Ligand binder design. Structure first.
Ligand SMILES: COC1=C(OC)C(=O)C(C/C=C(/C)CC/C=C(/C)CC/C=C(/C)CC/C=C(\C)CC/C=C(\C)CC/C=C(\C)CC/C=C(/C)CC/C=C(/C)CC/C=C(/C)CCC=C(C)C)=C(C)C1=O
Ligand SMILES: CCCCCCCCCCCCCCCCC[C@@H](O)O[C@H](CO[C@H](O)CCCCCCCCCCCCCCC)COP(=O)(O)OCC[N+](C)(C)C
Ligand SMILES: CCCCCCCCCCCCCCCCC[C@@H](O)O[C@H](CO[C@H](O)CCCCCCCCCCCCCCC)COP(=O)(O)OCC[N+](C)(C)C
Ligand SMILES: CCCCCCCC/C=C\CCCCCCCC(=O)OC[C@H](COP(=O)(O)OCCN)OC(=O)CCCCCCC/C=C\CCCCCCCC
Ligand SMILES: CCCCCCCC/C=C\CCCCCCCC(=O)OC[C@H](COP(=O)(O)OCCN)OC(=O)CCCCCCC/C=C\CCCCCCCC
Ligand SMILES: CCCCCCCC/C=C\CCCCCCCC(=O)O[C@H](COC(=O)CCCCCCC/C=C/CCCCCCCC)COP(=O)(O)OCCN
Ligand SMILES: CCCCCCCC/C=C\CCCCCCCC(=O)O[C@H](COC(=O)CCCCCCC/C=C/CCCCCCCC)COP(=O)(O)OCCN
Ligand SMILES: C=C(C)[C@H]1Cc2c(ccc3c2O[C@@H]2COc4cc(OC)c(OC)cc4[C@@H]2C3=O)O1
Ligand code: SF4
Lengths: 156, 70, 71, 105, 98, 83, 318, 175, 115
């Protein structure tokens, strides 16, 4: 049908815009953030992929959890994530954010950020290299390229 | 590259060319091709009104030369 | 030259206004055609409401706001 | 109260602005220059009490030049009579009052 | 008088009535005073332009000047009042009676 | 000569902007009175014909008034054409 | 036919803003030993389109605490004033020919400030409030000096009309007559457009995002377009004021090209300026404008009042 | 009454006056005064006073910005009031709007005197002058004559401004 | 007429842009999302509480100086008078008083912010 073709093209166009212009919130916790700083460094230059740090949660598309989430910090992390306008995506960076990591058996550590927020991409490492984080970012872009919102609305 | 900034600057220049050039072209087209008259003071406006009245077509830009003296 | 043409144009428009004012005012009981509002008998410059009053709105705008609105 | 130091010293601190018939820049006249000139010359030295009564004609002309109330009333009468004649269809305004006048320089 | 003159005059009357009534804030009454100056400026400008009084074209400008000082004056008083009470409420100006 | 010089040197060392501002202001105040071209400026301002020159009615004894614009009488702007 | 002219003035300016985003990103990249956007499209040419599409397809949030009416009004006012800035500019023929163009543009800028003021106040955020007060301070710092600078430079033009500036500079540039003013004027524009080193109302190093911290998606996009359009317009105004190109009444294309080149040069000058130095404290900017720029501006105003009288060189227009 | 432009602008002028005359939160009052200043600039421009309108608009915009700065500091009003958030503010706003409407209706349909005198209408275009001359602006020359004719005005105005600066310094001293 | 059309078109374009911004994307508002932002943790007080301004005196001075610029605005026209000496004297006198006001407030520590 022509409607199917139209919604397919519109979904592609919409997906392309979202994938291309990804704005992660300027937010780091621990060790891994330093590696994130190296992804914005001249060698890798995430800005050339359309990726721009933005301080305000509202003007942010991605939240990169780069570091250990503690029990004292979890409410703050949840709050900023909530204040991101949709669509929003979460990338878990490093062992500490993935599953607690080297502080897994600690009284003051949340064992993985996925108990607080839903996670899209899990980047392993301690810390993941700037190439590892960049690979995870491109994987998230490929995942966004794969999603279909207008097709589901049309079939439903 | 450093010359890869040039395509964006060229697109900027192409975009910024359009306002002034289009304004000049529209001014020529609407006023008969002769640089739309400027009336900063009332005397110039009176001149324009006289031209419009004597044009016989209600357009100020239509100019009557020596061929109206018989 | 412009002064002479302005004088003739104003006088002509006043004369047409007077002739029509006579035409409309047939049977108004105590109406004097062409009566002034000034005690003095000297010339008084027309109000421009006296000139384009009985005329179409387009040239009323042209006479009033024509210069101000022209840019 | 009023200490006329300007008249005593011949200074003209603020008398240049009191009337519109007094030496405007570039000789630009007021819209009712003649009427105010006549009214001022009528009542120059006779005094306020005599001026308010003996120079009332010039003052009335000046005020009706300023506000044009009588002219507005006359024009409104003309307009309403023309409108009532038109509404019942007996006037037929001429072409030159409808925008069809042969223009002149 | 045209309708424009009556509109400006009634705007001045509205601003004066707004000043003469105080709700709680001194800043609102200062705004009403400045509105009265604005209405006076507009009215005098229309009167001068209509009658072609050339030399009077400068008096509205002077008018604006003596608005600002007055406005400035008011603002100064306000901060002092605030410094005494922490609020610009006219209720606190009640130490002196009739 | 020995006190104001030291004061000016210190002011130039510390506040060059104020020294420049006061110098420019003093020059702008003083030089216009000491200039021969101010009268020329006033004459140029007077020579601009903003409004119509209304002719005077001939009574018979006005030798300094011209009868035609190109007559030798009347003001001349040849001082302006070479200025 | 006037609507066609309005659209021809509006749409190309928006496109030029969209691509000035790319130009600034690439200039900063190459000045910081990197490349900048070069992936989305050839040489990054499609990056602005992607950014706009992403921004206008993302949801907009209305804060519960914030007043909604003024919150919505502020970006509309900012963008509309940014677009209205361009109508009196002669290129070489203005869209609207005004007898008082400088005054109109100056007044319009004052109106534009309120949108920032109302964005900060209406957001009801402590961070939002701080940026708005910095905007108040900045405007208080810069307007007076900017106004006297315009008056002093226009004393040699004879009138406030912008089309007379081309005739004034038919033989020489105005910057050869008033270079000490131009410098200050340049700095004043940097303060008027909230640009580095005076990016204080939206200071990201202290205020996270400044006045528009609570804004997202479309309203934020409109604020961003208003910012960049104001940048380009002020640089065009500087070019017309101080760098007077020659005009051929039979060939206005040459004037348009030369003016556009000068405007682009000044815009690249702002981009070069932002990367080079750190942000000013908002009290240091006020002290710089009042204790340094104001005395020189007053002295130069006196000098430029006196000079035509001293040299018998008063401009024509009454 | 052609295009009703002057009348519409005057009506908006009075509406903005009523809005800030209802004594609501100062932020709203400044907004209304800005609106009234802009429409007053338009009214003055329609009569040929371009410089005065632009001048009045410019002064008020600068003045209001200062008023906003002061309101944020000293009239903050934790729950700021809008024209529909309070009983008395809405009452005053509605009363002003209805007085505007009734006076307009009576003066337009009828010819009634309010305080001074009555009116007829027919638009504000009638009072014009059809003056046809000049390579200059009469308003511009009238304003520029301040430095040649109004020397006394310049003296008193400059003295007043300097004294005003001294007055502000002395008043805000405290101690 | 042309300027009013220009303003109307600009305002209409901005309003259409904001309408597209608010009606095109999918919206899922909830209480947590709309809460005021303050670095994750909930703000202590409110935005409405008084905000001390340390440059109030400079603000009043700007109010007074703003008026002075209006007086200086008509100077270009005033330069065309036949009484050039009087106009120059008055313009210089006005600028000298403006500079004297600035100097007086500077020396009286009026340009320094409150602590
Ligand atoms: C030093 O780091 C930083 C940078 O460097 C990496 C930045 O770039 C930067 C600025 C942020 C950038 C990511 C730029 C973002 C680009 C915009 C948000 C895109 C906006 C452009 C559109 C809204 C314009 C409209 C698009 C149309 C095509 C124009 C035509 C309009 C139609 C109606 C026709 C900041 C703040 C920064 O801090
Ligand atoms: C006129 C309408 C105006 C409003 C709408 C906007 C109009 C213009 C919008 C822009 C049109 C083109 C945008 C997309 C251009 C394609 C770019 C291309 O690179 O995308 C590829 C293909 O894109 C998708 O197949 C489809 C995207 C576009 C959808 C079709 C176009 C629909 C709009 C056509 C214009 C008219 C629209 C009318 C709407 C009313 C996928 O690339 P990607 O794999 O990521 O790149 C990876 C980089 N690597 C290689 C290094 C890894
Ligand atoms: C009795 C004691 C006197 C001294 C006391 C001083 C206190 C009073 C303030 C000043 C009073 C002096 C009166 C000056 C009024 C100005 C009018 C007069 O002087 O003539 C003018 C001359 O003005 C000159 O510029 C000289 C006067 C300017 C004075 C300079 C500054 C004075 C200020 C000092 C006191 C002010 C307060 C303190 C300031 C620090 C006009 O000249 P002209 O252009 O041919 O005519 C124009 C009219 N046309 C166009 C029809 C031809
Ligand atoms: C200045 C730069 C920007 C210019 C402003 C206009 C930009 C125009 C860009 C067009 C992009 C295409 C629009 C599509 C985005 C729609 C947003 C979206 O994803 O909504 C998905 C939504 C999912 O809903 P459900 O499946 O029911 O599930 C809800 C329960 N959980 O599906 C929809 O509703 C989509 C329906 C199509 C919307 C109509 C779009 C037509 C275009 C109008 C815009 C006018 C542009 C000119
Ligand atoms: C906000 C905008 C307010 C200021 C508008 C300024 C317009 C302007 O300056 O243009 C001047 C222009 C040209 O005049 P001159 O160049 O001096 O000489 C003419 C002879 N050739 O004059 C005009 O065209 C006048 C036409 C009408 C003036 C505009 C009035 C519009 C007022 C807009 C206010 C909007 C309402 C405010 C609240 C909004 C919601 C209620
Ligand atoms: C009546 C003449 C008018 C014409 C000239 C005026 C034009 C405009 C200039 C005046 C503008 C306002 C000036 C205000 C002056 C105030 C100075 C002041 O108080 O600042 C002092 C410092 O200023 C000084 O050093 C004192 C004055 C310095 C010299 C001023 C000029 C002296 C004479 C110079 C010119 C002489 C004539 C020209 C010759 C030039 C050579 C060719 C304190 O510094 P702070 O910033 O507060 O703090 C610093 C510590 N943290
Ligand atoms: C013969 C008769 C002539 C009449 C007089 C004319 C001669 C005048 C001679 C002096 C003129 C100099 C004035 C130039 C401008 C004044 C600059 C100034 O003095 O301010 C600086 C400050 O200037 C700055 O800090 C600028 C900061 C922002 C920098 C932004 C980028 C730098 C400039 C980029 C290039 C600018 C291009 C200008 C022209 C552009 C084209 C229009 C001093 O500040 P502080 O050192 O902090 O002193 C205060 C503490 N005591
Ligand atoms: C914005 C670009 C240029 C760079 C800079 C930058 C990022 C990403 C994240 C951050 C950041 O800098 C800030 C400030 O300096 C540190 C220093 C830190 O370690 C000392 C640290 O660890 C959590 C975090 C931070 C901030 C962190 O949010 O990309
Ligand atoms: S995963 Fe390793 S490098 Fe990253 S924050 Fe945790 S401990 Fe530091």
């Amino acid at each position: 049908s022509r409607g199917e073709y139209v919604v397919a093209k519109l979904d592609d166009l919409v997906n392309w815009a979202r994938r291309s212009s990804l704005w992660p919130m300027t937010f780091g916790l621990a060790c891994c953030a330093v590696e994130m700083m190296h992804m914005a460094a001249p060698r890798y230059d995430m800005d050339r992929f359309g990726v721009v740090f933005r301080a305000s949660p509202r003007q942010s598309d991605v939240m990169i959890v780069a570091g250990t989430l503690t029990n004292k910090m979890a409410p703050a992390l949840r709050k900023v994530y909530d204040q991101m306008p949709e669509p929003r995506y979460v990338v878990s960076m490093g062992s500490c954010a993935n599953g607690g990591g080297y502080y897994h058996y600690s009284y003051s550590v949340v064992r993985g950020c996925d108990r607080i927020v839903p996670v899209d991409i899990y980047v392993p490492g301690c810390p993941p290299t700037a190439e590892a984080l960049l690979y995870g970012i491109l994987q998230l872009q490929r995942k966004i390229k794969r999603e279909k919102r207008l097709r589901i609305w049309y079939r439903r | 590259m450093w010359f890869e900034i040039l395509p964006g600057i060229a697109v900027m220049a192409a975009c910024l060319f359009i306002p002034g050039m289009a304004t000049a072209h529209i001014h020529k087209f609407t006023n008969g091709g002769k640089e739309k008259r400027v009336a900063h003071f009332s005397y110039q406006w009176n001149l324009m009104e006289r031209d419009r009245r004597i044009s016989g077509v209600n357009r100020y830009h239509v100019t009557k030369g020596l061929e109206n003296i018989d | 030259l412009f002064q002479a043409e302005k004088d003739r144009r104003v006088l002509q428009m006043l004369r047409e206004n007077l002739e029509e004012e006579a035409i409309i005012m047939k049977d108004v009981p105590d109406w004097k055609v062409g009566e002034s509002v000034f005690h003095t008998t000297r010339w008084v410059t027309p109000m421009m409401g006296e000139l384009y009053g009985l005329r179409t709105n387009e040239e009323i705008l042209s006479a009033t706001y024509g210069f101000i609105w022209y840019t | 109260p009023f200490f006329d130091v300007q008249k005593r010293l011949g200074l003209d601190l603020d008398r240049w602005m009191t009337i519109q018939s007094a030496e405007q820049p570039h000789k630009i006249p007021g819209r009712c220059h003649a009427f105010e000139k006549e009214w001022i010359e009528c009542a120059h030295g006779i005094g306020g009490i005599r001026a308010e009564k003996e120079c009332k004609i010039e003052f009335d002309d000046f005020v009706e030049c300023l506000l044009r109330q009588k002219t507005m009333k006359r024009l409104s009468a003309i307009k309403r009579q023309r409108d009532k004649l038109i509404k019942e269809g007996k006037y037929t305004p001429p072409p030159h009052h409808l925008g069809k006048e042969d223009p002149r320089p | 008088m045209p309708l424009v003159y009556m509109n400006i005059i009634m705007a001045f009357a509205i601003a004066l009535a707004g000043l003469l009534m105080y709700r709680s804030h001194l800043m609102s009454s200062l705004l009403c005073l400045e509105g009265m100056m604005l209405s006076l400026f507009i009215m005098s400008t229309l009167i001068i332009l209509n009658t072609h009084f050339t030399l009077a074209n400068m008096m509205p400008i002077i008018l604006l000047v003596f608005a600002a000082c007055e406005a400035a004056l008011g603002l100064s008083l306000l901060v002092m009042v605030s410094n005494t009470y922490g609020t610009d409420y006219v209720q606190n100006l009640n130490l002196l009676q009739c | 000569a020995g006190r104001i010089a030291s004061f000016l040197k210190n002011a130039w060392a510390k506040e060059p902007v104020l020294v420049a501002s006061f110098a420019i202001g003093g020059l702008a105040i003083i030089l216009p009175s000491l200039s021969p071209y101010t009268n020329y400026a006033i004459r140029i301002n007077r020579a601009t014909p903003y409004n119509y020159p209304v002719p005077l009615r001939d009574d018979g004894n006005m030798p300094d008034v011209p009868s035609h614009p190109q007559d030798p009488q009347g003001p001349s702007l040849e001082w302006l054409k070479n200025l | 036919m006037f609507m066609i002219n309005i659209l021809s003035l509006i749409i190309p300016i928006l496109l030029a803003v969209a691509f000035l985003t790319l130009v600034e990103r690439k200039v900063l990249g190459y000045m910081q030993l990197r490349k900048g956007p070069n992936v989305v499209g050839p040489y990054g040419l499609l990056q602005p389109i992607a950014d706009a599409l992403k921004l206008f397809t993302k949801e907009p949030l209305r804060p519960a605490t914030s007043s909604i009416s003024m919150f919505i009004i502020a970006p509309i006012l900012a963008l509309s004033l940014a677009l209205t800035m361009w109508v009196p500019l002669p290129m070489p023929y203005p869209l609207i020919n005004m007898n008082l163009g400088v005054l109109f543009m100056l007044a319009m800028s004052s109106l534009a400030v309120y949108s920032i003021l109302w964005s900060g106040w209406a957001s009801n955020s402590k961070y939002a409030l701080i940026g708005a007060l910095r905007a108040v301070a900045q405007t208080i710092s810069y307007e007076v000096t900017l106004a006297i600078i315009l008056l002093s430079v226009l004393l040699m033009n004879g009138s406030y009309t912008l089309s007379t500036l081309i005739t004034t500079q038919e033989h020489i540039w105005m910057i050869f007559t008033s270079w000490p003013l131009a410098m200050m004027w340049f700095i004043s524009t940097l303060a008027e457009t909230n640009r580095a080193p005076f990016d204080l109302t939206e200071g990201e190093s202290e205020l996270v995002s400044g006045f528009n911290v609570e804004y997202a998606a479309g309203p934020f996009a409109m604020f961003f377009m208003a910012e960049y359009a104001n940048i380009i317009m002020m640089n065009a105004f500087t070019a017309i004021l101080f760098l007077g190109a020659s005009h051929d009444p039979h060939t206005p294309e040459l004037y348009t090209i030369n003016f556009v080149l000068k405007t682009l040069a000044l815009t690249i000058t702002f981009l070069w300026i932002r990367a080079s130095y750190p942000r000013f404290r908002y009290d240091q900017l006020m002290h710089l404008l009042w204790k340094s720029f104001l005395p020189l501006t007053l002295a130069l105003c006196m000098w430029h009042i006196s000079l035509p009288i001293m040299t018998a060189s008063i401009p024509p227009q009454s | 009454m052609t295009m009703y432009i002057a009348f519409i602008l005057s009506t908006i002028f009075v509406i903005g006056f009523v809005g800030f005359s209802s004594k609501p939160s100062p932020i709203y009052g400044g907004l209304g005064l800005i609106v009234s200043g802009g429409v007053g600039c338009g009214i003055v421009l329609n009569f040929g006073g371009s410089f005065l309108g632009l001048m009045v608009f410019l002064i008020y915009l600068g003045g209001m910005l200062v008023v906003f700065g002061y309101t944020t500091a000293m009239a903050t009003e934790m729950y700021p009031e809008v024209w529909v958030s309070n009983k008395t503010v809405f009452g005053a706003f509605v009363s002003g709007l209805m007085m505007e409407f009734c006076m307009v209706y009576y003066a337009l349909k009828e010819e009634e005197v309010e305080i001074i005198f009555k009116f007829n209408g027919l638009g504000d275009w009638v009072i014009y002058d059809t003056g046809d001359s000049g390579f200059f602006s009469e308003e511009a020359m009238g304003i520029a004559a301040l430095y040649s004719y109004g020397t006394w005005l310049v003296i008193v105005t400059g003295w007043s401004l300097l004294i005003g600066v001294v007055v502000i310094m002395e008043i805000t001293r405290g101690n | 007429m042309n300027i009013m059309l220009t303003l109307l078109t600009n305002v209409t374009l901005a309003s259409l842009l904001v309408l597209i911004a608010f009606w095109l994307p999918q919206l899922n508002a909830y209480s947590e999302k709309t809460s005021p932002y303050e670095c994750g943790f909930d703000p202590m007080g409110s935005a409405r509480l008084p905000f001390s301004m340390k440059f109030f005196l400079v603000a009043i001075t700007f109010l007074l100086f703003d008026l002075e610029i209006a007086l200086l605005l008509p100077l270009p026209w005033a330069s065309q008078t036949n009484n050039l000496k009087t106009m120059l004297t008055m313009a210089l006198f006005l600028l000298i008083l403006l500079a004297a006001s600035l100097a007086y407030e500077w020396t009286q520590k009026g340009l320094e912010w409150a602590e």
